[PDB]
Design an enzyme around this catalytic site. Structure first.
Site, mmCIF file in Angstrom:
data_model
loop_
_atom_site.group_PDB
_atom_site.id
_atom_site.type_symbol
_atom_site.label_atom_id
_atom_site.label_comp_id
_atom_site.label_asym_id
_atom_site.label_seq_id
_atom_site.Cartn_x
_atom_site.Cartn_y
_atom_site.Cartn_z
ATOM 1 N N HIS A 62 48.620 39.056 40.433
ATOM 2 C CA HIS A 62 47.176 38.894 40.581
ATOM 3 C C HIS A 62 46.722 37.452 40.369
ATOM 4 O O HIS A 62 45.605 37.084 40.735
ATOM 5 C CB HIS A 62 46.426 39.833 39.632
ATOM 6 C CG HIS A 62 46.698 39.574 38.184
ATOM 7 N ND1 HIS A 62 47.505 40.392 37.421
ATOM 8 C CD2 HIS A 62 46.270 38.592 37.357
ATOM 9 C CE1 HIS A 62 47.563 39.923 36.187
ATOM 10 N NE2 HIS A 62 46.823 38.831 36.121
ATOM 11 N N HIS A 92 45.697 29.413 34.700
ATOM 12 C CA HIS A 92 45.843 30.032 36.008
ATOM 13 C C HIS A 92 44.573 29.730 36.781
ATOM 14 O O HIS A 92 43.633 29.163 36.230
ATOM 15 C CB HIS A 92 45.998 31.549 35.870
ATOM 16 C CG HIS A 92 44.849 32.205 35.166
ATOM 17 N ND1 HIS A 92 44.792 32.333 33.794
ATOM 18 C CD2 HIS A 92 43.686 32.712 35.641
ATOM 19 C CE1 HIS A 92 43.642 32.890 33.455
ATOM 20 N NE2 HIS A 92 42.953 33.129 34.556
ATOM 21 N N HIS A 94 41.683 31.153 40.043
ATOM 22 C CA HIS A 94 41.164 32.206 40.905
ATOM 23 C C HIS A 94 40.578 31.540 42.135
ATOM 24 O O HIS A 94 39.802 30.591 42.023
ATOM 25 C CB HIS A 94 40.058 32.989 40.193
ATOM 26 C CG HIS A 94 40.465 33.549 38.865
ATOM 27 N ND1 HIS A 94 40.781 34.878 38.683
ATOM 28 C CD2 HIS A 94 40.596 32.961 37.652
ATOM 29 C CE1 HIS A 94 41.094 35.084 37.417
ATOM 30 N NE2 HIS A 94 40.990 33.937 36.770
ATOM 31 N N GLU A 104 34.736 32.256 39.783
ATOM 32 C CA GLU A 104 34.232 33.464 39.150
ATOM 33 C C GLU A 104 32.829 33.156 38.655
ATOM 34 O O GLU A 104 31.883 33.873 38.973
ATOM 35 C CB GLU A 104 35.150 33.883 38.008
ATOM 36 C CG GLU A 104 36.532 34.264 38.514
ATOM 37 C CD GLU A 104 37.252 35.205 37.578
ATOM 38 O OE1 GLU A 104 37.487 34.824 36.414
ATOM 39 O OE2 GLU A 104 37.575 36.329 38.011
ATOM 40 N N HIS A 117 41.356 28.276 34.753
ATOM 41 C CA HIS A 117 41.139 28.795 33.412
ATOM 42 C C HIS A 117 42.282 28.396 32.484
ATOM 43 O O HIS A 117 43.436 28.748 32.727
ATOM 44 C CB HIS A 117 41.037 30.323 33.446
ATOM 45 C CG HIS A 117 39.771 30.832 34.062
ATOM 46 N ND1 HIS A 117 39.628 32.130 34.506
ATOM 47 C CD2 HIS A 117 38.587 30.220 34.300
ATOM 48 C CE1 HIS A 117 38.410 32.294 34.994
ATOM 49 N NE2 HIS A 117 37.759 31.151 34.881
ATOM 50 N N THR A 196 38.227 38.178 32.394
ATOM 51 C CA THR A 196 37.659 38.583 33.679
ATOM 52 C C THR A 196 38.494 39.561 34.497
ATOM 53 O O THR A 196 38.112 39.937 35.606
ATOM 54 C CB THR A 196 37.328 37.366 34.550
ATOM 55 O OG1 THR A 196 38.530 36.651 34.847
ATOM 56 C CG2 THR A 196 36.345 36.449 33.822
HETATM 57 ZN ZN LIG Z 1 40.985 33.605 34.801
#
Ligand SMILES: [Zn+2]
Length: 258
Positions: A62, A92, A94, A104, A117, A196
């Site tokens: 993910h 990591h 997103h 996010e 993050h 999250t």
């Molecule tokens: Zn994150």
């Protein structure tokens, strides 16, 4: 079957397995810059990453995480709205399928191409597993990425993604300096939130930097070549692994600047 970012197991479905998804301090949220309150009480952030020891990079289905040795205070975050010392454990990103989405958190409803993050845990709790059970257990540094000029310090990360294309794959990743990913200014907003992705625990003290860091379209493109699936399984590109903004509810976003 399990949670993911697809049409049948996406964020809108998470509440069925993780009731806290409808909690009181969920993340991410939209940062309304005109409602955020400047707080002179907030001290400058103290980032000490000079002794950071990266170890491995892995594709966990993910995202991809770049793990650090957190057995000692090698890379820590202090100051800001934090009390105590927080050790970096992993970072990591997103990202989206298009440059117009991916982050996010949003600023005045503006979405960025991606969001980095850097996850740290409160040393007073011993270990990461115990820290996630506390309201002040984690402190995640959020950095927005906009598409423009390439970021030199990120290329090392980009070049190894080929070796961890599918879920479960990992590669040795030593001597990576996370300082190359930070913007010039450390001005920030901060608010109490959660993780999250499941299990969405409300143990986070979010510290989102105001200044984005620029990456080239070619660098982000390589993020989009990763797979959610494991080797030997049908290919499903790893894109849009972001959760939409959640209700702010009874929370105040504070700014370290004005
Ligand atoms: Zn994150």
């Amino acid at each position: 079957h399990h949670w993911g970012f697809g049409k049948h197991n996406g964020p809108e479905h998470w509440h069925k397995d993780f009731p806290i998804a409808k909690g009181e301090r969920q993340s991410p949220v939209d940062i309304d810059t005109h409602t955020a309150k400047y707080d002179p009480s907030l001290k400058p952030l103290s980032v000490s990453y000079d002794q950071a020891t990266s170890l491995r990079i892995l594709n966990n289905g993910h995202a991809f995480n770049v793990e650090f040795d957190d057995s000692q205070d090698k890379a820590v975050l202090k100051g800001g709205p934090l009390d105590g010392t927080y050790r970096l454990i992993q970072f990591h990103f997103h990202w989206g399928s298009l440059d117009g989405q991916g982050s996010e958190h949003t600023v005045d409803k503006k979405k960025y191409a991606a969001e980095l993050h850097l996850v740290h845990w409160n040393t007073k709790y011993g270990d990461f597993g115990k820290a996630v059970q506390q309201p002040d257990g984690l402190a995640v540094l959020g950095i927005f990425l906009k598409v423009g000029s390439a970021k030199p310090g990120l290329q090392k990360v980009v070049d190894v993604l080929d070796s961890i294309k599918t879920k479960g794959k990992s590669a040795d990743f030593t001597n990576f300096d996370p300082r190359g990913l930070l913007p010039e200014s450390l001005d920030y907003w901060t608010y109490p939130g959660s993780l999250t992705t499941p299990p969405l625990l409300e143990c986070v003290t979010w510290i989102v930097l105001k200044e984005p860091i620029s990456v080239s379209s070619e660098q982000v493109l390589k993020f989009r070549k990763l797979n959610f699936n494991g080797e030997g399984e049908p290919e499903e590109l790893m894109v849009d692994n972001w959760r939409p903004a959640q209700p702010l509810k009874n929370r105040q976003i504070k700014a370290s600047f004005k």
